[model samples]
Target: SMAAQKNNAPKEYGADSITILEGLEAVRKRPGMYIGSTGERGLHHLIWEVVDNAVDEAMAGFATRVDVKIHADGSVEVRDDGRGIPVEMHATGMPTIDVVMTQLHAGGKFDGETYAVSGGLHGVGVSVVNALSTRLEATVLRDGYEWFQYYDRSVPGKLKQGGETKETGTTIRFWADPEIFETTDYNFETVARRLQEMAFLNKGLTIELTDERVVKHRVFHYPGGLVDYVKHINRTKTPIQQSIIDFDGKGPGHEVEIAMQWNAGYSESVHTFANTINTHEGGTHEEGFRAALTSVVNRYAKDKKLLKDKDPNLTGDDIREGLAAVISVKVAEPQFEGQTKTKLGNTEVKSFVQKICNEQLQHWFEANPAEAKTVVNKAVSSAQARIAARKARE
Candidate 1:
């Protein structure tokens, strides 16, 4: 009983089906693709996206402080002590601030010279927030004057010139649109946790969070950077070494910083990041660090007489057992495949990180004989435990 009309294809397709999702329209249409979700996670993501820009300024050595505030009116504000957005006429025949506020993929990070390394390499700039929010206001202290602009759903109002000021930075306040988000309420703890990690990642850059509703204020600043990060993670666990193995160095167009320690626990907790953004899936940099770790430990055990000549080389699992580590690398132009910065694809980073880790780690071990012996012995114990488990299972 197949009808001819039903069987016939609806072939009235035209160019309109391929609708040109112009600029910010695409972001609002598919907000999840830009912010990850429309749920609570995405609600929190809005803050991170804005904060990432501020953090980028810090990474460029132009920002020293970033302040975040949650207002009772359900609006969030972020201020950075960095260079403000330029108000000069853009090549697009509009104010640079207007272009940046209204257009997607419009930011200074694209010009590699503006930022040596940045957290916003994903290119999801402030304009995305402008699209998803009901209102977004910006105040820029630049050129000896304060410039003010308020955007409603990505349509920027007049950018006004206000009082003169010596300060130089940018402050943004945004109200999440109820139409797009399930919840506009901001969580203090969730925001604090990530902000604290950001402060840890960027040493000396103080980040503050204040919740007006609850009257809570917290400041996060870590002078030791990754070394302090390791300590914080291993605060409860018993460490095997007296000093945490921490070192930093630079390679061709990249900077590497790593801090690690062996704890008495049975699990390995190694976190890796590229340009301060966490790479949970891990990529070349982790590969390099792991390879360097195993090789150095095996070589150390053999040369230092810690491993009796008969013991087989310790595996990476054995070397990393009960180890807590933080590996952070900054590349001028990281090769992340797409929207997700969870994996690094730059082929050169692997070898560069590996080489740096290999040489510096060896130096660290050689410099501290007692601590080095303790670390090697811990790995040997782990290897022995593995062998014992296999024998028992057999």
Candidate 2:
């Protein structure tokens, strides 16, 4: 009876009838609703979306180099010489390119297995970019054919199937929506600093930016990944140890590469990512890494007799004091909080990271007894300081 009910429910009712919404109306009505806003960070996020599309290509083993340039007219452009946006016709006769650039949730990313372990989670990156752009263009060079589309506020102006190009790529240039955004123009220096930071994190990805909006232009590229990434971020600090314990881990939808290094500092700095999309607001993966690091260190300390008589076992916070590390994961179909995908909320990812880190980091601690002892001693001192601080307040 249930099977019959489903069969009779209506031909156009299942997943296909999910009703494709049109235009950028929803994003405009709620500007904060799209990429999370007109604030300074939100203004900057517009640029990140374009860069992310290029980054997605890089992650999928498609593109190797990503170039971001800021033009003289205060417009930002992200050009990727990757497989450009798809430009075929859908079953509904809508230009496939139009569906991707203007319609939310209409990209190859929705089907995880196809682009497994990709950076575009929401499938909304380009759509949000289109919504926030005063003018957005889509270009494709597939099957020896060049195709292009121009959109004014997410409405297609022209869909041309032929264009001039020797290479295949996508270039999106947008002047931020002045009506929807607080500032149509953003600070080049601030963005430049951030791009340099990201270049280090992504390793092989190269970022070339020219901001004539400013007096000078700059370009950045890093090939060493998180190893050099830490050094770049901690340029102000002197490292206590010159070695980094780097390792890789895998999950159902992702893979993670982490770096652990000792620095001569009083605080810990951790940078985390999910699917090459920075989970800057650390989530389950970050938590699992912390727990594993603490457990491994505590066990090593106890076994080595490095713990003092009065000192208790080290907590994650205690072991991480003055510690500097980076946890970066690459994945597919990430379940993020919203359009921004700032927070990684996928519960399955927790156990995946925990299992991997627990096995690897603990093995490292066991094999390198001498290094473990040194770390445990540092952890013990950190624990003692905390206890003393708590007692002083009492």
Candidate 3:
């Protein structure tokens, strides 16, 4: 009877259940909680966190060049041409550079006004990287003076002033902790793809990824941004339209940019991002786009008699066939759903994106009637096939 009743087995939920993680100790204790993992993906995430700082500067219109090098000694180096981390003293009596690299929640990103939009808003990126690195060195150039510092597993060294330099930027070099990570080896393809994506997202920002271990190097600078990304992804496919459909506009505190192309291929490549962070799982932004896309195409087809009244409306899947698109939006403070930022949770972004796509896509179709007709025909065919399949099933 006691077993049938409510059982008690060390189920005391009290104040002791609350465990606070102070400083970088929490990051070192649970690296996965900060960087996602200590495996191959996490190893690459380290490079991304370091590179994101440079990209953030670029997005803020401060930096333009970011160079990444994987030295033969298994160390990674990231150099950026941006206003370096401030060398002045923080309120905590430590140099700003030390606080940024050692404190998990300390950085310029917390002040939304400082960086209107950024990918590392959580601020744990670089600090977590520092905690997981066996040895890390930071060289910051600011105020006509260069500052140098080093750390061993999140422990800071004496901040020393170096010779004056007219240039201003930051250079971070670190050796991944082999004891914590399963592997410290870098993958060229994975790193290159991500850097290329960053370059595409931040137009005119030249990012160079070099692997001295393999004597390989690649430079990514996409002045055309998402337009170039669409073309690159559809390079092997046959595009049905001569010009890519592009839309860019800003609304209040939000900016939406989109590039799309319809190819002869069967599969679709739809990539979405918020402030340069890939939303692989998609969310409201993607939903808004899909809704507007279907609405626009259906309205146009119906007007042209391509879609009869009795015909079924073209679904999002039908319209997506042979379509390649890139959707990127930048908001002052993005509400991402997860640590990986694979989904956007901002409800307002849906309407912003929908309005932009509706207006611009409508204009594109009206200006290019012939291409519009071709696109409509493609969707009509897809809908017809689906209806036929459904009837066959019955």
Candidate 4:
């Protein structure tokens, strides 16, 4: 034993341990690598991706009813009467839907024309949905018959025999894969919290989510759109106005919407997104809106002599403090950071937002002079306080 202990271990590092996976195998072997983890988040992600597809359709003005049902079982059903999943055969001889479900990278999101603006910008969204679903039914309600395909544990099954029946839209019913997830089931409250976010971003869209598995029934719907969402967020605080400021406009390459208001709170809560995808690190469009908001408020205030004789300009931080805002944009070809599409990179979106906000908000302010006065006074007060605080800190 003593003699054997004298042997020294060798240390080495090289490429020999590297493993390579081609095609669908890459996603199948490392599903967690893509969706974050094999936990409840991944389980919930299945529903998110499917719902995101429906929301994308809604954003394009095609999906009028995006119904989500958390069935009596732990499974989920997301149905939309829009164009449904693209079922035509692709260049690979595989049905486009099949390619999207089975392969790693396949979808109409990145190309723009198929989807002018979408949350699943990575183009691999539905495929990931299929990969993560244990028991999946992808039904296309198009061409007179509802075409159906089933997958068990991400393994494709033969399409239901009628050789593609007549139905036009997509209904996705799926059960999360327990083998790959910490738990196939999720908390209704968690799902509700997210649905509430959707209700905020998409004012008119109906998001009906129920947990048949739970004792409590929950539902979320916001008709006033983002404004209602802002109100909800500010519910805990005292707001300066009864109604939030909401604006909408159509411009080149995109549509823009903004909802904002001020409250008596100290923290500023602002969230921006493009195509329903949360832009954690805001890109050009967010910057453009910030600039426009600052410019508009400042110019209006200065013109009306609201600002003292030679007062300094209002900065973003000053105006945004104690403010709550939600900015949503839809555009073709959103360049996101990665498959998650957490940030937008389309430079044109910034200037486009600037143009619309400037034009639309200017007129809006003119028409609603009372609200304009409140806004200007608020900004000026915020500006003065900010200057005083800075001087003290300095």
The per-model lDDT (C-alpha) reads 0.87, 0.74, 0.87, 0.76
| Shift of residue 178 alpha carbon in model 2, Å | 1.3
Q: TM-scores for all candidates?
A: 0.89, 0.86, 0.91, 0.81
11-105 in candidate 2: lDDT tens per residue? 65588777554547777767687767687778888888888778777767677777676777777877887888777777658877787777777
In angstroms, the error of model 1 at 322 is 2.1
Candidate 2 lDDT (Cα, whole model)? 0.74
Backbone clashes for every candidate come to 0, 2, 0, 13
- C-alpha RMSD for every candidate: 2.9, 8.8, 3.5, 4.0
lDDT of 3 by residue, 1-394 (tens): 7669765577689999999987787877888777678899889888888988888888888898999999989999999989998878999999888888888667787767778899878767888888889899999998888899999878889989999899999999999999889999988998988898898998879998888884398999988899999999899988888889988989887998999999887887999999898888999889989989999998888887888899778888889999999999998878887456668999999998999999999889888998898888787777687688999994
lDDT of 1 by residue, 102-156 (tens): 8777778775888888877655668888888999999999999999999987788
For candidate 3, which ten residues in a row score worst on lDDT?
2-11
lDDT of prediction 1: 0.87
Question: For model 3, which pairs clash?
Answer: none
Choose 1 or 2, whichever is better by TM-score.
1
| CA shift of 121, model 4, Å | 3.5
